[PDB]
Design a protein around this ligand. Sequence first.
Ligand SMILES: O=C(O)[C@H]1O[C@@H](O[C@H]2[C@H](O)[C@H](O)[C@H](O[C@H]3[C@H](O)[C@H](O)[C@H](O[C@H]4[C@H](O)[C@H](O)[C@H](O[C@H]5[C@H](O)[C@H](O)[C@H](O)O[C@@H]5C(=O)O)O[C@@H]4C(=O)O)O[C@@H]3C(=O)O)O[C@@H]2C(=O)O)[C@@H](O)[C@@H](O)[C@@H]1O
Ligand SMILES: [Ca+2]
Ligand SMILES: [Ca+2]
Ligand SMILES: [Mg+2]
Ligand SMILES: [Mn+2]
Length: 770
Amino acid sequence: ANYETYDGFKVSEEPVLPEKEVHPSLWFTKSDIQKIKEKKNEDSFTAELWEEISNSPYLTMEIPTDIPSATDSDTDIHKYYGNMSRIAKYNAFMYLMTGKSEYRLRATEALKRAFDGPIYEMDPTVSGSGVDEIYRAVWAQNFATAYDWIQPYLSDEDDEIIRERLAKEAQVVYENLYTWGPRPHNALSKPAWGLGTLALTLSDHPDASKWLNRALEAANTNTLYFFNKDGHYREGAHYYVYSLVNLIPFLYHYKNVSGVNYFPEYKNIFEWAVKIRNGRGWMPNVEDSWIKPAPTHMVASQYKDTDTDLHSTAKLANILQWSYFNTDFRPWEPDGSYTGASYDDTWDIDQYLTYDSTIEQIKPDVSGTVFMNNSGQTVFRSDWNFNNPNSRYLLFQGVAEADNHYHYDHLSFIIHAENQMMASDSGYSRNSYGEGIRTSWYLTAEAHNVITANGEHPKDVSENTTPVSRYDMDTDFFDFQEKEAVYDGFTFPEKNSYDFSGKQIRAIGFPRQDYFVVADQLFSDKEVQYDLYLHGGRGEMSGEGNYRLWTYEDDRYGQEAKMAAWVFPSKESIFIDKEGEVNYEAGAFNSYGYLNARQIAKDTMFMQIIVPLSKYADIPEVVDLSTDDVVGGTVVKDNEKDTFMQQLNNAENSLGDITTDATFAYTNENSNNELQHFSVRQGTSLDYKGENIFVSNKPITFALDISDETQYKGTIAALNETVELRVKNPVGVPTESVVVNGENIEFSVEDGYTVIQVAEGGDININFGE
Ligand SMILES: O=C(O)[C@H]1O[C@@H](O[C@H]2[C@H](O)[C@H](O)[C@H](O[C@H]3[C@H](O)[C@H](O)[C@H](O[C@H]4[C@H](O)[C@H](O)[C@H](O[C@H]5[C@H](O)[C@H](O)[C@H](O)O[C@@H]5C(=O)O)O[C@@H]4C(=O)O)O[C@@H]3C(=O)O)O[C@@H]2C(=O)O)[C@@H](O)[C@@H](O)[C@@H]1O
Ligand SMILES: [Ca+2]
Ligand SMILES: [Ca+2]
Ligand SMILES: [Mg+2]
Ligand SMILES: [Mn+2]
């Protein structure tokens, strides 16, 4: 695996340390302490956070006089060092906050027994080790923080003892960082930031410059490979948050101690979370990942002067604050831990010290639809409303495979709508990474919403190269994008030769921002077996032929609802009911229906029509009109007739009322059976009921709303060269202006048609008189 070719990001590796150690200074200086004590009375959140911290059993539990030996169980060794680190930090904090004698004594004794017992005897490369690098990253930050807090109140003797313990662990971590995490995943990054905290806590110690330099070096191998510039993490939401437990603290530690502010550089990893969140503020169960909330509140304070694309006027800080608190947290009751470190973390404290009660929660006001083409994700999204059933969310997953915690999920999608999780990623596993069922099922292509050719999964052209995206179109009435993966390409484990050569070109469209169309073009050099899968998450599957209906109930993830799905073409394809596991969180796995549509062919097409519905909604009337060269049909939902059409060539053909040379075409009628909205992929004409709507001298991809006869408005996808578009005016009405990207462009009117040269794409308004 090549770890240096992915379009990630890295910061300065130059170690910056202050002239002289200051304690406290990691989170705050001496001056801040009475402000922090008072903080508990700002709002109901700071109140709850204080209620939790001040009643922590780590203040009242007996410091254990039972040091466990090397040959004890891996769990008990974990919890010993976890509890000790926790006893140190919780007590050290509560001494600052109350001044109670006991708390200083407990903190001091716990810090004096930091990394006592068998830790340095044992081997962390061993799998699941009680002292694995990932756990002693949290421990290191817990003890180092505890020290920074109690250091002033220590005898010259106790200071020198505790300094030598933290300074040992620091040297051990420095020496064995790359041995423990030989590949740059979260097992390298987490303990690296752990070292970073230690280096900054003991800034005077002679080795600190070397410690911090490696800490930043090792961290940068993670951000260069597993992170994208645009903020995507390739280990998925779960290991993103697991990474945050150690990163977020270090980010603050290095600012507060050395005046090195990395928050601008790490900005996009927090924006990302908000962009891929569903109706209830959950990050998706993609790659080795459960559903996860994004702790964006704990960094909001640093982005008060940061612009975002997510609001016209407001600053990122306000959106980051909005995102966290607009998250359903019921899937983590009554415990409340979503970090992945519930044996080690001090999340109540770290939230107390980071939360800023002065930041106004502001909902994004921009188009919900977002195209993050650099990583390869894309979200169709009707609105940003929290826990609204009228909301529609589709994640379109086309991300270059990484070498750790990977699932085969190219051109997969998931859907959130009617407040339920519908079309599904089958999720991480039953429970853990080392389970057979993860390799035999959960990570396999078939456990996802893909198309396999002879069982081979759609994959990257070349390693660390994001699947190409085309025809990005966002509007009020219809969004659209296509992604291209290949079958005979690059994946993990590495597989150099294939019996054939083929590719998938999956287009997704968002008709009436209400339901979805998934229109696949498939090309191959040989005849092969295309298998389309469609998992309906955790629903009772029913229905025969080309139609399936998943019915959901009030579960731990949403409300009573249903998803209806039709597959085209009906005749050339066969439909196979199958049963597979779907898991959104540890231990909560179950078997559910999933559809296997199958064709045997060389070059062919599929089309899925997928419709979220509320429990007792009428099932739309969906008619297949597919033939030899043309796949597509008609949907009659809420008294409007939508028509879809795909083909493999720019060849004049018909379906329903459409006639076009476009590889894809969409139409919306109103109650009165008049064309209102239409979109085309690389068309040069479209007739509806045999009435021409537009023509062009070259192939153009655009969507247009023609429901208002004073103004036609839509968008035109990116252009390679000047096109002469000609749109038909409403009968006997003159064109006044044409606006593309808020600038006028030159227009004539010939035979009832507005005529424009367009050399770049963007939002178009054709403005009409009377
Ligand atoms: O607090 C809670 O809510 C629950 O937390 C639970 O803790 C979980 C965490 O949430 C994470 O899932 C954490 O992630 C670990 C995971 O436990 C495993 O250790 C897994 O193991 C593999 C590594 O990821 C990595 O792939 C490694 O690769 C090797 C590979 O074999 C090969 O030889 C190659 O050449 O070398 C590499 C290498 O670099 O070493 O193999 C590891 C393996 O063991 O197979 O890694 C993840 C990770 O990425 O960090 O796991 C904990 C956990 O304890 O389970 C849990 O405590 C639960 O009880 C709580 O309720
Ligand atoms: Ca993947
Ligand atoms: Ca839109
Ligand atoms: Mg290890
Ligand atoms: Mn998966």
